[PDB]
Symmetry: D2
């Protein structure tokens, strides 16, 4: 149930296709990256998770560049997919901007985003 | 100069191919994931960085599963490639394990890894 | 309104006294640290925040040791106090365990905790 | 050997006094906070670490306000003190700025700092 369309708490949409090889492909919109544009995502997930009741660990990367905009930054999400009655993806993320060496200390943002299948 | 073979401070090797579309593909070995096995990585990087002297922001994901082992975890690196005389990739990373809901608070590790082209 | 008794999403209680010098003192209970024991906290907050409508940035540290237990770890919370009708403290946290040098890569946990004044 | 004067990789000085109660008090200078000013720190450390050879887990908070400046931000460091021939404090840190609710996603920076006793 990991393949589908997901929404976070802020309004981003996360359309993803999980493959049997463990690949993870799709698109991302709708800020923290930028206001109104689609961005390519790619990532991985473990395709045979534990059956003791557990999250399916996954992660994906969006580089914030398309034909319209370039923010010179990349966000990687790292979390686990929690199956059940309401499907849930709880992630931590890191957003790194391309900086000079004197500005390398303030290059990385950190936050968290939870994803649901309903909005 | 982002395509090539990289080594971190602990002994991991990071063989990567950057594509013109912004894609990022390769393999990863040699602990924090697991001891001696190859793992598929995928990620993204911005393919037209700023020319004011700046890092090329990038990120990639490894799910720690191959034909030999499965740790039920995924690591995402987020950093910038710093070009120059000695090439350098300075990253922060998040390692998320698949846990139960009662253990969801301790599911995510955080650290940092710097990558050089010589070892 | 930062002085008082706070509760997170998991059941921890956070009794804190803010001082006019910017000091921050109190006690902490009730897991991620350990099950049922009180722990000394200390931290700081900016005592003259911006009046444009903004969070009051704060942070505090708990070392998980009292007369009963010692987990050999410390958690630091970093967040902002958001005033209003419902008072709110939204934090990110880092929990570092004392490890050997070979285990230094997995020494730091990361998560997030939001605190309210009602439970 | 945790009491003393420490220096990071960027030039910050970290003068600290550890107490027998587990308290941690001192001053901080010299950027990531701000250019040239002293700031009060407070924090905690476990006062009876493991004797199997291990770091002493510690953490401290600096709110970036004194009589001269106010950045409306706070940094918390979380790490372990590694004793030996060369004393070492390896930390991760979180820097949270006071933001509006619409800017709450980009409020927290993350990085790392290693501290030595010689500069």
């Amino acid at each position: 149930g990991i393949t589908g369309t997901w929404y976070n708490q802020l309004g981003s949409t996360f359309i993803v296709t999980a493959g049997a090889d463990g690949a993870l492909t799709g698109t991302y919109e709708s800020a923290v990256g930028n206001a109104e544009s689609r961005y390519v995502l790619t990532g991985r997930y473990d395709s045979a998770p534990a059956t003791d009741g557990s999250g399916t660990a996954l992660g994906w990367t969006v580089a914030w560049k398309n034909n319209y905009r370039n923010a010179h930054s990349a966000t990687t999400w790292s979390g686990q997919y929690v199956g059940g009655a309401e499907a849930r993806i709880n992630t931590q993320w890191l957003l790194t901007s391309g900086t000079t060496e004197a500005n390398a200390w303030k290059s990385t943002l950190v936050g968290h985003d939870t994803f649901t299948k309903v909005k």
